[PDB]
């Protein structure tokens, strides 16, 4: 569950429990992963902010009502009032995450000082060069991706793993390949592999769908055994599977991700493809906006190696008596 | 971020991201608010023009180095290059902005023609006897505090609204008197208020040193409760100080602003006294400068109603070849 109550505002990011938001009143949503929207459901009876591709998604398949969902255009500043009569605003700018479609970081700005929150992301150099970010604001708070905040774990681009894949597809000309995905996510990759080997992806209806929203070449279909690659749960790649794979056709399996999975059948390939930043990334990134101070989002994953990066902190902001009036409740007072 | 970059010149004012300003060469502070020093630290390496008090706080709390900082005195005309060969210069002259303390603005003279840039300012009719707008010259581009150019918001004076204050105090004689300001500015209502009441402001260690730079009388200390006037922080004023601050004295806040601000607490008080020039004064300052062209300095906020006021436009001026190669990239 890897969202968070900003402290000492109204502001939660991915983070969906009303019994545990009580001061919460302003609601995002980076992305459409599950553990980014961990007890949003079509029960959900707030006004909630998000991209227009994940405004897409979370309708289609979470059902939360349209009313409820107001999506923002990517790399727009959006005024957003922070009490009942808009006296106190905040802007919000998203900016692209690069981690999966629909995936953005938020810039918050108002009387809190300056937040970046990144959701789930890959950093790339593009990413220091977008305009809000080229202004010499202070980041106060850096809320970062650690997922892969390791220095132990070695990742190579994208686009190298991507290569990776294509020498290792070249090698099999006569094969079926399997590419064992998150429902979300990667559909990039797989128009490369399709655009290199002139053959059609194999996609689920859900997947199709989504498809349609990126701009990607013409290469997608449902049409079973239509082309040569195959996008599949990640979860379908195992031993049992190429038994059965096999006897039908000659199959090789790829998972790319950047997790530690043993190869149990010698044609299943994992090969460190990632959406979230490296620890190296990790480390550009920082230093580049040295942020007052670093908090993790994904909680259960180590996050360190920053301490030389921070500026020197600043106090915490004092809440403005307005925006107190609207993060209090009613349940919260005697009688 | 209230900093502009001026087309078809080397000239940014209030304006600190070098990323965006590749072929700014002269860099001018209008004042140290906050939000005229975004990306503005000890980072710096650029010569820098501003006033001999904006001088002395940008080196005290932000840290740019003394050798890039150029104090400027105000209402003395100056000769800068714009280049490196000893050919093309400008005049700049500082003029009072009557803002807060350091405050100017700006009159450019060159090539590029007369520019005003007022900063953030308050007009006063004073501020036309300038000598230095009463030699006739015509105002190519005026560069316009715009925050209150609002037709509907109307401001008194600020002797007015000081009055409004002075009121107000004499209503609670046992009372202490929360003033919540800005970091910088509206020290000479303090001092108002103080030789008023006969009574000292209490105010923190660094507003002290800023007050030494100003010819106020002697009624500032920093000692805790030794006066009736305590300045603090305009964000302390709230319901929830109010009830902190009566278990010990009995106490009425003030927040002097022009601000739309809703008061949580009986004796929180919203008074309007402002640093900004209201509508009205914005008219009658454009209407005597009759400049060719106004354009609005805070960009998150309206501007207009001085199409009435301008004077024929005028063609860009050519960018002397000199001053291009300063600017190259
Ligand atoms: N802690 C945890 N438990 C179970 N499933 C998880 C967890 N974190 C992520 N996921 C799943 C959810 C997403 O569909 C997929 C990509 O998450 P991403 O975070 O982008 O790598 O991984
Ligand atoms: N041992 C383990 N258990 C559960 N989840 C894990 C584990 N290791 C990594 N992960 C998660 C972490 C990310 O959500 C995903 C890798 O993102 P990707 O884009 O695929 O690199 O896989
Ligand atoms: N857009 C914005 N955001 C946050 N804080 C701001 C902004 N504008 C001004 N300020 C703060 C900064 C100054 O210290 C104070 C007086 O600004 P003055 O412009 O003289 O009225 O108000
Ligand atoms: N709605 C709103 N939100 C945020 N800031 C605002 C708003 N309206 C005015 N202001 C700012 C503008 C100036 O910086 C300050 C007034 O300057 P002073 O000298 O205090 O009159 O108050
Ligand atoms: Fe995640
Ligand atoms: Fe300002
Ligand atoms: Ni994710
Ligand atoms: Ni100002």
């Not at 995905?181 to 399709?194: C, P, T």
């Amino acid at each position: 569950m890897n969202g968070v109550l900003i402290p000492h505002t109204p502001i939660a990011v991915d983070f969906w429990s009303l019994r545990r938001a009580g001061t919460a009143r302003l609601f995002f949503l980076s992305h459409m992963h599950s553990d980014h929207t961990v007890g949003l459901s079509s029960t959900w009876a707030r006004p909630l902010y998000c991209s227009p591709i994940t405004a897409h998604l979370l309708h289609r398949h979470l059902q939360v009502s349209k009313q409820w969902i107001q999506a923002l255009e990517v790399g727009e500043s959006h005024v957003l009032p922070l009490d009942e009569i808009g006296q106190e605003t905040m802007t919000v700018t998203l900016l692209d995450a690069n981690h999966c479609p629909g995936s953005v970081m938020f810039l918050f700005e108002g009387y809190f000082g300056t937040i970046l929150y990144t959701g789930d992301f890959r950093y790339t150099p593009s990413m220091l060069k977008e305009p809000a970010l080229t202004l010499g604001k202070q980041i106060h708070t850096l809320y970062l991706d650690n997922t892969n905040c390791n220095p132990a774990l070695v990742l190579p681009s994208r686009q190298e793993a991507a290569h990776q894949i294509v020498q290792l597809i070249r090698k099999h000309p006569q094969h079926n390949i399997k590419i064992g995905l998150y429902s979300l996510g990667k559909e990039s990759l797989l128009e490369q592999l399709a655009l290199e080997f002139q053959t059609w992806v194999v996609l689920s209806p859900r997947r199709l769908e989504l498809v349609q929203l990126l701009g990607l070449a013409d290469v997608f279909t449902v049409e079973e055994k239509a082309g040569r690659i195959h996008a599949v749960d990640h979860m379908e790649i195992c031993h049992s599977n190429m038994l059965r794979w096999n006897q039908t056709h000659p199959t090789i399996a790829i998972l790319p991700t950047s997790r530690k999975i043993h190869s149990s059948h010698p044609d299943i390939h994992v090969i460190p493809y990632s959406d979230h930043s490296s620890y190296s990334e990790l480390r550009a990134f920082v230093a580049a906006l040295k942020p007052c101070q670093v908090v993790p989002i994904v909680s259960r994953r180590p996050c360190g190696g920053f301490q030389d990066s921070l500026s020197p902190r600043i106090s915490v902001p004092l809440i403005p008596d307005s925006v107190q009036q609207y993060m209090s409740s009613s349940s919260r007072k005697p009688s």
